[PDB]
């Protein structure tokens, strides 16, 4: 039985790859179970640390996980933060890859309010996909609540004391996942709150077609790639998105891609749109969602 930071049992490996290991496990003073993250200490670019900055900034956060330690021992930097559930990603693939609209209109509201608290803490996401938002673990009472992980992309988009907005800028270098990317982000901009909102309508999408039509483009490099998908998004009008789905989702994307770079979304008003599909469908947000159906 292998300890960390004077009280955390190390339990069944997670996950593995170039960031590090991850371990499920469990806090010993008071039996809370745990996710451990071991990053290598001599790594070409150190996230872990900076990561545990961001949690502390966000600890206290409604369905953020909490971070209970940070520190360096053995080979490796050491991160402990509450334990979730399933990835949306993990769910998608388990119902098929694809959600019905019931369940994506909650888990819309939701991811919004997440980003809206992030924003809330002066932080920009920057990496936004359905990987990083988790469900709970069962039985508690936010088993089948979103949560929001992973905050090694996030950034600092207004002065935390004065509120003074980050500069606008363009000619930047292609930051985050290209098929959930704003097409600002696409242009070299400075990433802002905008650009989280239109990512976050991306994934509401892939989660209602199953796919997004600008997967699977062909290009001899990937700034070609980038470049190609950037373009297609740019064509794509919305309601070709909405396609058989409910108009609000071609008009919540269409609002979040017209907002100026410093600008406050509208977060009530985005969960209030959504939310008014159920209305239209007779259906109501009761917390039954397709994955319960496993």
Request: glycine share 8%; charged share 25%; aromatic share 12%.
């Amino acid at each position: 039985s292998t300890i960390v930071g004077l009280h955390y049992k190390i339990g069944k490996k997670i996950g593995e790859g170039s960031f590090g290991v991850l371990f499920e496990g469990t806090n010993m003073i008071n039996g809370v179970p745990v996710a451990i993250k071991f990053e290598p200490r001599k790594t070409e670019a150190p996230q872990l640390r900076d990561e545990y900055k961001t949690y502390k900034i966000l600890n206290g956060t409604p369905n953020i996980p909490y971070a209970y330690y940070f520190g360096q021992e053995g080979l490796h930097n050491i991160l402990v933060i509450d334990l979730l559930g399933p990835s949306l990603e993990d769910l998608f693939d388990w119902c098929g890859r694809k959600f019905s609209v019931k369940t994506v209109v909650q888990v819309a509201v939701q991811m919004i309010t997440l980003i809206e608290d992030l924003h809330a803490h002066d932080l920009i996401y920057r990496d936004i996909k359905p990987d990083n938002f988790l469900i709970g673990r069962p039985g508690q009472p936010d088993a089948n609540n979103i949560h929001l992980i992973d905050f090694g992309m996030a950034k600092q988009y207004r002065d935390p004391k004065t509120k003074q907005h980050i500069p606008y800028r363009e000619k930047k270098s292609l930051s985050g996942t290209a098929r959930y990317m704003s097409i600002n982000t696409h242009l070299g901009r400075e990433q802002s709150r905008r650009d989280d909102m239109e990512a976050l309508g991306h994934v509401f999408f892939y989660f209602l077609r199953g796919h997004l039509p600008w997967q699977g483009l062909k290009a001899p490099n990937n700034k070609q790639k980038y470049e190609k998908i950037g373009e297609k998004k740019r064509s794509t009008n919305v309601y070709d998105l909405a396609q058989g789905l409910p108009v609000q989702f071609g008009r919540y994307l269409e609002i979040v891609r017209s907002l100026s770079f410093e600008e406050c979304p509208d977060y009530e008003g985005y969960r209030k749109l959504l939310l008014s599909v159920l209305d239209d469908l007779g259906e109501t947000a009761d917390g039954q969602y397709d994955w319960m159906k496993l």
